[PDB]
Design an enzyme around this catalytic site. Structure first.
Site, mmCIF file in Angstrom:
data_model
loop_
_atom_site.group_PDB
_atom_site.id
_atom_site.type_symbol
_atom_site.label_atom_id
_atom_site.label_comp_id
_atom_site.label_asym_id
_atom_site.label_seq_id
_atom_site.Cartn_x
_atom_site.Cartn_y
_atom_site.Cartn_z
ATOM 1 N N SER A 90 0.749 -1.111 -0.018
ATOM 2 C CA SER A 90 0.048 0.104 0.101
ATOM 3 C C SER A 90 0.813 1.280 0.194
ATOM 4 C CB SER A 90 -0.901 -0.027 1.139
ATOM 5 O OG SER A 90 -1.937 -0.928 1.178
ATOM 6 N N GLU A 141 -5.716 -3.333 -6.879
ATOM 7 C CA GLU A 141 -6.015 -4.217 -5.624
ATOM 8 C C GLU A 141 -6.801 -5.320 -5.729
ATOM 9 O OE1 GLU A 141 -4.450 -3.704 -2.709
ATOM 10 O OE2 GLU A 141 -3.715 -1.786 -2.691
ATOM 11 N N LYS A 152 0.208 4.016 -2.494
ATOM 12 C CA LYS A 152 -1.053 5.095 -2.311
ATOM 13 C C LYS A 152 -0.656 6.635 -2.191
ATOM 14 C CE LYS A 152 -3.988 1.013 -1.035
ATOM 15 N NZ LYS A 152 -4.371 0.381 -0.032
ATOM 16 N N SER A 168 -5.889 3.290 4.219
ATOM 17 C CA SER A 168 -5.533 2.366 3.255
ATOM 18 C C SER A 168 -6.488 1.731 2.597
ATOM 19 C CB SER A 168 -4.450 1.450 3.732
ATOM 20 O OG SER A 168 -3.644 1.179 2.989
#
Ligand SMILES: [Cl-]
Ligand SMILES: [Cl-]
Length: 263
Positions: A42, A139, A45, A103
């Site tokens: 993550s 994702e 991001k 997240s």
């Protein structure tokens, strides 16, 4: 010294650790496995949010624009998107905040859709001078962290340099840079990772990530009481540790790294 201390953490925790501490302008101060590839998980991001802010800066995107989706777009970890789905959208701003601070994987996928997908994020990395980082999947499959797979990877040094550019450089406008910084400061998932290994008087913002095969990562900016500005990237694979132990490992790395900053 820093290399020996990190090696000692590796041995003790049966872990692979990659770290880069860089200056405000992205210059390496200390590193260990700084040029080895690790899965972003993550941590992607952060540059993703920056790309969306760059689109807003360019006048191509409106922070209040409604990004529509339905239940099929949800992901297993999507705490915000699950709350909003009945309304049929999240705004660009909601999606940026959720992707960064919670997240949320559906919010991240909304933003990937907004920017044009993984290839366009990879183009953005190249545009910033990051020759290495690359997003390939959305994702949740970007988190597989499969040995030998270069998909969805960065290096600690490339990510530290890229984040330094975004946070302290001039690629974003002053308005968007400030927005990104305040969002990262308010991250809700990083209280036990890099921030736990830094003095509470320092301003810190960060983006965490977890992956399969024991992956646990965190990239932070911080400003010390002397006003000196740094980025620290920490990438770990520690399959023999429990979750809380993986966070403690990253905190321990940050404590070692802060011995090299001006307090
Ligand atoms: Cl510098
Ligand atoms: Cl939540």
């Amino acid at each position: 010294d820093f290399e020996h201390a990190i090696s000692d953490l590796e041995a003790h925790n049966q872990a692979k650790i990659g770290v880069a501490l860089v200056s405000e302008n992205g210059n390496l101060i200390q590193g260990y496995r700084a040029n080895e590839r690790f899965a972003m998980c993550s941590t992607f991001k952060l540059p993703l949010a920056a790309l969306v802010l760059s689109r807003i800066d360019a006048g191509e995107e409106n922070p209040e624009r409604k990004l529509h989706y339905d239940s099929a777009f949800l992901e297993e970890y999507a705490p915000a998107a699950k709350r909003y789905v009945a309304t049929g959208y999240m705004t660009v701003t909601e999606a940026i905040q959720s992707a960064l601070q919670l997240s949320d994987n559906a919010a991240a996928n909304l933003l990937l859709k907004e920017v044009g997908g993984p290839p366009l994020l990879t183009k953005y990395f190249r545009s910033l001078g990051d020759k290495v980082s690359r997003l390939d999947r959305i994702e949740p499959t970007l988190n597989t962290n499969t040995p030998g797979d270069e998909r969805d990877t960065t290096t600690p040094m490339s990510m530290a340099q890229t984040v330094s550019k975004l946070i302290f450089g001039d690629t974003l406008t002053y308005k968007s840079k400030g927005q990104l910084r305040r969002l990262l400061i308010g991250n809700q998932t990083g209280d036990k990772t890099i921030r736990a290994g830094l003095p509470d008087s320092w301003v810190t913002g960060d983006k965490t990530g977890s992956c399969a095969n024991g992956g646990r990562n965190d990239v932070a900016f911080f400003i010390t009481t002397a006003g000196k500005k740094y980025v620290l990237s920490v990438y770990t694979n520690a399959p023999e540790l429990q979750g809380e132990e993986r966070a403690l490992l990253i905190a321990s790395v940050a404590k070692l790294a802060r011995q090299y900053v001006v307090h």
